[PDB]
Design a protein around this ligand. Structure first.
Ligand SMILES: CS(=O)(=O)c1cccc2[nH]c3c(c12)CCCc1ccc(CN2CC[C@](O)(c4ccccc4)C2)cc1-3
Ligand SMILES: CS(=O)(=O)c1cccc2[nH]c3c(c12)CCCc1ccc(CN2CC[C@](O)(c4ccccc4)C2)cc1-3
Lengths: 296, 298
């Protein structure tokens, strides 16, 4: 059966759950601490798996103890490991995450490991007949554009029913990533990217950036407690309010939960308006739980 | 018979250090300057310093087998710390502490995670042949069990001539009510600035005057107060002081308190006066604050 492919990076999150944000130069006792497999594309596979959609993860990996944890973690979620790109240099990146249970905040201290990125040559090895949807987490944009051109070229030879749907996420405010707006059926732009571009709402960001998307594409922008908006070729702005839980305890991976839920809903043939609502409902539910498991 | 060792009873921690250029704002993503794995724990860090200073030492702590235990045991072993009294546990794991070191300000922020590792009990301590040690330092943790260990040392000392008596030090570093009974034990009592402030004291002198009535007859109460230096108070009621010796650039204060304690113990265990030991404690700890880790102190 056709799967959803997620192309991105896997990070190991070292999470410290606290009752208050630590003051500089103090010693605080953690409520709990845990290891969790992170990374945008990687979190989206976890959510797609929990929602019941067969999915695969394509990312760079370096052999060892961290890879054993990560691959074992993916296996627990039946996330297909076929396209794992093993590297001979670098390590899996580690992120230190402070989660403030009282405010719901997540603070990340990121450590780059010098792990080589998935290249266009690595992607050429992917048998595209096995996938109905391919999601690409924007990172090494010049290589990723070649991957997207490979998908576009495959799609020209397929009937409309057999075309692979594509989504791209532009989550970091890096100039190199903005070329990715012109690719994919669904383009996810983060609130962080929108604010760095001068936009003060999801609606402003969509109207201001729609000119950059491919003909027929849907541009999506989640705006935390203000909910999420989308804009398609008909010019109709779509919106869903946020659905915050009674107590916000964990926002780590909330954006990834939203993206996976929108992809899931759209792949099942739901409207963009239904997909936005579903995204907000699942991410909102996630924000009231530690991790992802409790969403189901 | 060989030179007698200094035994440190405490816990070994794995420090997961994030070196940063600024203190992270809540809900933001920051890139670390570097990240490293370092063996921590108060008594464990004091062993590192005693070893670097050249004093033979031994560490008694709980351990759970695994990758973390292999890293911390190999690290202690590189410092020739005697580990024959390591208590291997069948439940729990070696604790992990997340440390944020702000290179710009010289701060250290600790997020500590108790990994349900059982503590060293009084029954575990009963197995220690005390004839090996000239000094026993106890990092306050499971106080009711530790009080029994201290009573065992006191009982051993009643049967020994004054030259053969084992000197004892205790550290009360965490502001936990259970630990305050430990002030009544040991020849030397270390009280942290954190404990003193939690108890309402605003200076080392106030803390020493305010807490001296709780120490054993003849004990020396010691309190280091970061950039204000360190003070000590003994049975004559004379408050002793050393100013701090700050480095030109304060880069790493993680384990500075442990550097001070080990240096004071080292100095007193070598017949130096309390005044000489305070000065030495500030000199070594002040030097440590100017460098990442402990090795550069020598
Ligand atoms: C798809 S979605 O569901 O729209 C979504 C996607 C991505 C991220 C998201 N964040 C949040 C939502 C959300 C929406 C519902 C839950 C929620 C409640 C409260 C806050 C606001 N809080 C969270 C810490 C906070 O940002 C903070 C900052 C600094 C100090 C203390 C707290 C202030 C955000 C969200
Ligand atoms: C045995 S000892 O040597 O007395 C000692 C024992 C234990 C801890 C120690 N800390 C420091 C010393 C020290 C003494 C000399 C070096 C020094 C210089 C400057 C500061 C002050 N800095 C360090 C972060 C700081 O306290 C901070 C607080 C909040 C925000 C940002 C930084 C502001 C402390 C020390």
């Amino acid at each position: 059966e056709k799967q959803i492919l997620c192309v991105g990076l896997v990070v190991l999150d070292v999470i410290s759950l606290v009752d208050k944000y630590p003051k500089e130069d103090s010693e605080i006792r953690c409520l709990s601490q845990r290891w969790q497999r992170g990374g945008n594309a990687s979190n989206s596979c976890t959510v797609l798996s929990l929602l019941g959609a067969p999915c695969a993860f394509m990312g760079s990996m370096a052999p060892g103890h961290v890879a054993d944890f990560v691959l074992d973690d993916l296996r627990r979620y039946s996330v297909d490991l076929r396209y794992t790109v093993f590297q001979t240099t670098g390590s899996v990146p580690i992120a230190t995450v402070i989660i403030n249970e009282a405010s719901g905040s997540r603070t990340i201290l990121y450590y780059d490991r010098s792990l080589p990125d998935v290249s266009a040559t690595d992607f050429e090895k992917v048998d595209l007949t096995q996938f109905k949807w391919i999601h690409i987490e924007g990172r090494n944009a010049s290589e990723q554009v070649k991957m997207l051109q490979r998908i576009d070229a495959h799609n020209t030879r397929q009937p409309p029913e057999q075309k692979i749907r594509v989504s791209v996420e532009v989550e970091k405010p890096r100039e190199e990533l903005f070329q990715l707006f012109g690719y994919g059926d669904v383009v996810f732009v983060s609130k962080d990217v929108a604010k760095h571009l001068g936009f003060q709402s999801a609606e402003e960001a969509l109207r201001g950036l729609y000119g950059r998307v491919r003909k027929g594409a849907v541009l999506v922008c989640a705006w935390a407690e203000e909910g999420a908006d989308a804009l398609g070729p008909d010019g109709k702005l779509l919106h869903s309010d946020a659905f915050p839980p009674p107590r916000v305890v964990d926002t780590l991976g909330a954006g990834d939960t939203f993206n996976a839920s929108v992809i899931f809903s759209l792949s099942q043939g739901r409207s963009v308006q239904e997909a936005l609502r579903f995204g907000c409902q699942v991410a909102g539910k996630k924000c009231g739980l530690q991790g992802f498991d409790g969403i189901v």
